[PDB]
Write a protein that holds these residues in place. Structure first.
Motif, short mmCIF file in Angstrom:
data_model
loop_
_atom_site.label_atom_id
_atom_site.label_comp_id
_atom_site.label_asym_id
_atom_site.label_seq_id
_atom_site.Cartn_x
_atom_site.Cartn_y
_atom_site.Cartn_z
N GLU A 167 -15.48 -9.93 -16.21
CA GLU A 167 -16.42 -10.99 -15.96
C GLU A 167 -17.14 -11.58 -17.22
N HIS A 201 -14.60 -11.42 -7.20
CA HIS A 201 -15.31 -10.32 -7.83
C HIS A 201 -15.82 -10.75 -9.19
N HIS A 210 -19.94 -11.49 -10.25
CA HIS A 210 -20.61 -10.83 -11.36
C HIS A 210 -21.49 -11.80 -12.12
N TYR A 261 -17.39 2.14 -7.69
CA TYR A 261 -17.02 0.87 -7.06
C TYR A 261 -17.13 0.93 -5.47
N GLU A 264 -21.40 -2.92 -10.10
CA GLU A 264 -20.16 -2.74 -9.37
C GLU A 264 -20.29 -2.53 -7.89
#
Ligand SMILES: COc1ccc(C[C@H](N)C(=O)N[C@H]2[C@@H](O)[C@H](n3cnc4c(N(C)C)ncnc43)O[C@@H]2CO)cc1
Ligand SMILES: COc1ccc(C[C@H](N)C(=O)N[C@H]2[C@@H](O)[C@H](n3cnc4c(N(C)C)ncnc43)O[C@@H]2CO)cc1
Ligand code: NA
Ligand SMILES: [Zn+2]
Length: 866
Positions: free
Chosen positions: A260, A293, A297, A377, A316
């Motif tokens: 990210e 995802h 972020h 995660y 996460e």
């Protein structure tokens, strides 16, 4: 190296506020000039300690003065006698082409690119490489323009020039202060897919997707998914992108999936490139999820970052929670939930019983790259989902808003986030915070009682967490325990007590407690732990009839699936025991009937039918046992597959034909039907041989998409059908020049039930499409073998272990992050029988003895042998 401890966190003695980088790029020798504005906060006699690895220091100045008051230690430049405010200038050299570990500045084919998370920036220059130091970056890149026509870094291009000798430069500036793990630089020649997105409030964002020359045709889906992500973040969280440009670069050599980096995400090309004939449905849905995802972020990770690496789950857990919600809103919520729960119970639970067990906020770390984990995660996200379950969406959103209002532009902790949820919601999460500090899977035991005199249903619920290798002390958690009570017609009995409604999410906060429900007008069948409301093992003494009742009547689709898993679990265990005594499969007729009913029920979402007809993986199966017999589990999975195939042959074929689709579309209803269809195909492959060979040979050759071609090739490998070698040769001949496409093939080779599978895998080390330098290839051949072929990996003769040992002997020097992932199956030795432990322990002892043992392997090997 040395272990680091969370309780030793201290604010830094120095801050950097601004850094001005120059890279004179060359793959053999890059020269980095780094001008940092710095501020001392600690004592006048505390030196500045800069992290640095494999740097050649050329010079050091302080306010333009050649500095003499410094030294170099292991992994550091220590600078003494500094003023309170100064300009630090470091010039150093690095070598991207030598960098095989893929951490820092390295080479991916002809491109140069970066990976800085977690502690990779220190391979680029001497810095305060810790995420509570945030600075405004400016980045100037100088390079040969024929090799490196595109020069990218975070933010906006602010300056450009041409030089003598066919060189040019570009300068970038990112206004948002950031920790250095979010720095990125990319240089190379690319095709670029360019598009735009207009935010809800009107800001126009240029989107640019950089891919290797020739791949612009595999880019539109990624681009589409980025736009979907931006829109959804707006709709669900009220979050807009904050810059003018969004860059994504797809590179083939990458250890993570996606990074990210602010305004310049760098992606494993696996989670970017898709075409109908190269990528499956699951690849599409993966690409959507990973793009999402990385995008999510931008707020949960970047605008609010992490104080220290022990807070990894802050970003996460929350960002996985967000990618799961995004996938679930856009597609099937149930299918998302089912697969996330498969991963929790089948891989993560194994990790939390392993020597590598850790809380979602770890207390100790040797090598932080070891903590990019299922636990951090997936369990992380479960913990966030539990806060959501406790607060509800309105309160959860208020907590999100408070979190950003307080922490925007700074580095925070897990505890800050929980605190924002608590303050905003007025729900007490004190006890809840224990999920962050305690490792291992809690076991929740449930006992029930129906009293017909009083029309009361009593649940006695008890919890314990077993001790883990990392923690001897365990205490009770705040477990949100969701229930529904069904009556004899399949209707929900309203939950109540003393004449008032009771919430259906029970607060199971004690070692033992009792809940009593009134006006339970009929003895209920319960749905316990609805939607996997807490990441726990459930112990309840279900009858088979209770389970099939739930399969027919449960309100939530996930419960119907889950009931079915509990139904199969009893029989998996039974048949593993039978296998050990030389006995054939036994299965009651009524279990077969339950599955027949799902196949023929015309009202059931086919997405759900498919998941009920997808047997637990060998990994989900292994978690039902204290001691794992990997051979029995594999053979029983195959036998249960053969028996359902025989029992259900006519029904399976009918549903296979009924869900034929001439058009291919990447659309949720079409994916459901195709998924059901290919689930039926897989059973059919294990049925009558001729018919199987015909069906599968035909689907492979006739398929207009890779989902259908692969489902068939995969069935052919798994049932060992006659057409196998020929289909596998065809696939290789057509696709060998394409690494991502071949990964699927290597996975099939690696996971084959054939007798000589190891011998073949060794041979595939020489294959045209394999290379030890590419993490994707490694994970697909070697990693799939060790992780996903437990029967062969755990061959009685120890041949699997020694193979892994050889591979790790190479990978420990080349790419220790990948090595460390590949070791993970060997450190599970305490789950296996004595003779297997003996051989696995010896393997670990051999690896413990490598000269230049990486810290990554060291951390794991010593935990495993302790
Ligand atoms: C990185 O990007 C992704 C991409 C996709 C997913 C979702 C997908 N269901 C899925 O792949 N889910 C899973 C897994 O398939 C796989 N995995 C992670 N660890 C292992 C493992 N152990 C030896 C540790 N063995 C086999 N497979 C493993 O990675 C995923 C972790 O959720 C998650 C992350
Ligand atoms: C032979 O044994 C093997 C071989 C390979 C692996 C890597 C495995 N895919 C894997 O764990 N990979 C991952 C995961 O556990 C997690 N992770 C990284 N990215 C994500 C993600 N989004 C991108 C969607 N979603 C969920 N989890 C993610 O961090 C890890 C490192 O990037 C594991 C075991
Ligand atoms: Na000083
Ligand atoms: Zn992430």
């Amino acid at each position: 190296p040395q272990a680091k401890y969370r309780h030793d966190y201290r604010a830094p003695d120095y801050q950097i506020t601004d850094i001005d980088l120059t890279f004179d790029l060359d793959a053999q020798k890059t020269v980095v000039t780094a001008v940092s504005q710095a501020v001392r906060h600690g004592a006048s006699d505390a030196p500045l300690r800069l992290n640095g690895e494999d740097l050649k220091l050329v010079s050091v100045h302080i306010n333009d003065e050649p500095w003499t008051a410094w030294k170099e230690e292991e992994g550091a430049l220590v600078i003494s006698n500094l003023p309170e405010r100064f300009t630090l200038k470091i010039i150093n050299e690095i070598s991207p082409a030598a960098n095989t570990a893929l951490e820092g500045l390295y080479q991916s084919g002809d491109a140069l690119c970066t990976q800085c998370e977690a502690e990779g920036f220190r391979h680029i220059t001497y810095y305060l490489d810790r995420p509570d130091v945030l600075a405004r970056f400016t980045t100037k890149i100088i390079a040969d323009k024929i090799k490196y026509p595109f020069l990218l870094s975070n933010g906006n291009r602010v300056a450009q020039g041409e030089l003598e000798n066919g060189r040019h430069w570009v300068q970038w500036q990112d206004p948002f202060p950031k920790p250095c793990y979010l720095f990125a630089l990319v240089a190379g020649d690319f095709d670029v897919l360019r598009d735009t997105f207009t935010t809800r409030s009107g800001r126009e964002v240029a989107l640019e997707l950089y891919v290797d020359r020739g791949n612009l045709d595999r880019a539109p889906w990624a681009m589409t998914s980025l736009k979907n992500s931006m829109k959804w973040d707006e709709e669900r969280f009220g979050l807009e992108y904050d810059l003018d440009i969004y860059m994504i670069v797809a590179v083939d050599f990458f250890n993570m999936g996606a990074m990210e980096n602010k305004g310049l995400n760098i992606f494993n090309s696996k989670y970017v490139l898709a075409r109908t004939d190269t990528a499956t449905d699951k690849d599409y849905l993966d690409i959507e999820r990973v793009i999402g995802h990385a995008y999510f972020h931008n707020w949960t990770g970047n605008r609010v970052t992490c104080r220290d690496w022990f807070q990894l789950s802050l970003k996460e857990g929350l960002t996985v929670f967000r990618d799961q919600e995004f996938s679930s809103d856009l597609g099937s919520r149930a299918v998302n939930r089912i697969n996330n729960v498969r991963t929790m119970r089948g891989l993560q639970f194994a990790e939390d019983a392993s020597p590598m067990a850790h809380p979602i906020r770890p207390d100790m770390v040797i090598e932080m790259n070891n903590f990019y984990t299922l636990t951090v995660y997936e369990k992380g996200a479960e913990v966030i989902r539990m806060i959501h379950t406790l607060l509800g969406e309105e309160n959860f959103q208020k907590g999100m808003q408070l979190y950003f209002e307080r922490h925007d532009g700074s580095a925070a902790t897990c505890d800050d986030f929980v605190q924002a949820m608590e303050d905003a919601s007025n729900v007490d999460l004190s006890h809840f915070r224990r999920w962050y500090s305690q490792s291992g899977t809690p076991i929740v035991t449930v006992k029930d009682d129906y009293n017909p005199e009083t029309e009361q249903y009593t649940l006695t619920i008890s919890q314990r967490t077993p001790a883990t290798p990392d923690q001897a002390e365990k205490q009770p958690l705040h477990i949100p325990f969701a229930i529904e009570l069904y009556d004899n017609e399949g209707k929900v009995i309203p939950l109540q007590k003393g004449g008032h409604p009771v919430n259906s999410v029970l607060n199971v906060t004690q070692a033992e407690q009792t809940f009593v429900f009134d006006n339970v007008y009929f003895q209920p069948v319960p749905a316990l732990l609805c939607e996997f409301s807490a990441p726990v093992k459930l112990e309840y003494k279900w009858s088979d009839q209770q389970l099939t009742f739930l399969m027919r009547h449960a309100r939530n689709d996930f419960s119907r699936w889950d009931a079915a898993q509990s139904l199969l679990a009893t029989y998996i265990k039974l048949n593993v025991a039978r296998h050990q005594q030389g006995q054939p499969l036994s299965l009651p007729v009524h279990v077969a009937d339950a599955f027949r009913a799902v196949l023929l029920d015309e009202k059931i979402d086919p997405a759900l039918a498919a998941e009920i007809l997808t047997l637990p993986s060998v990994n989900e199966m292994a978690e039902l046992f204290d001691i794992i017999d990997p051979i029995a589990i594999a053979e029983v999975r195959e036998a249960l597959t053969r028996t359902l195939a025989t029992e259900l042959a006519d029904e399976l074929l009918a549903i296979y034909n009924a869900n034929y689709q001439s058009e291919y579309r990447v659309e949720h209803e079409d994916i459901a039907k195709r998924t059901l269809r290919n689930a039926c195909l897989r059973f059919l492959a294990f049925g009558e041989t001729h018919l199987a060979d015909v069906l599968v040979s035909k689907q492979f050759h006739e398929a207009n998409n890779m989902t259908d071609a692969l489902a068939a090739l995969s069935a052919a490998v798994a049932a060992q059908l006659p057409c196998r070698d020929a289909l596998m040769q065809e696939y290789d001949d057509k696709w060998h020049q394409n690494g991502l496409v071949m990964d699927k093939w290597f996975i099939l080779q690696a996971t084959s039930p054939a007798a000589n599978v190891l011998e073949t895998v060794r041979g595939l080390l020489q294959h045209r499409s394999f290379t030890m330098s590419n993490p994707n290839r490694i994970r697909s051949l070697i990693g799939a073998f060790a992780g996903s072929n437990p029967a062969a990996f755990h061959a009685e003769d120890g041949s699997g272990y020694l193979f892994l040992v050889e591979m790790l002997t190479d990978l420990n020097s080349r790419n220790p992050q990948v090595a460390s992932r590949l070791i993970e199956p060997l450190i599970r030795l305490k789950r296996y029988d004595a003779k297997r432990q003996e051989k696995m322990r010896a393997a670990l002892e051999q690896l413990k003895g490598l000269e230049n043992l990486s810290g990554d392997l060291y951390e794991k090997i010593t935990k495993a042998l302790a």
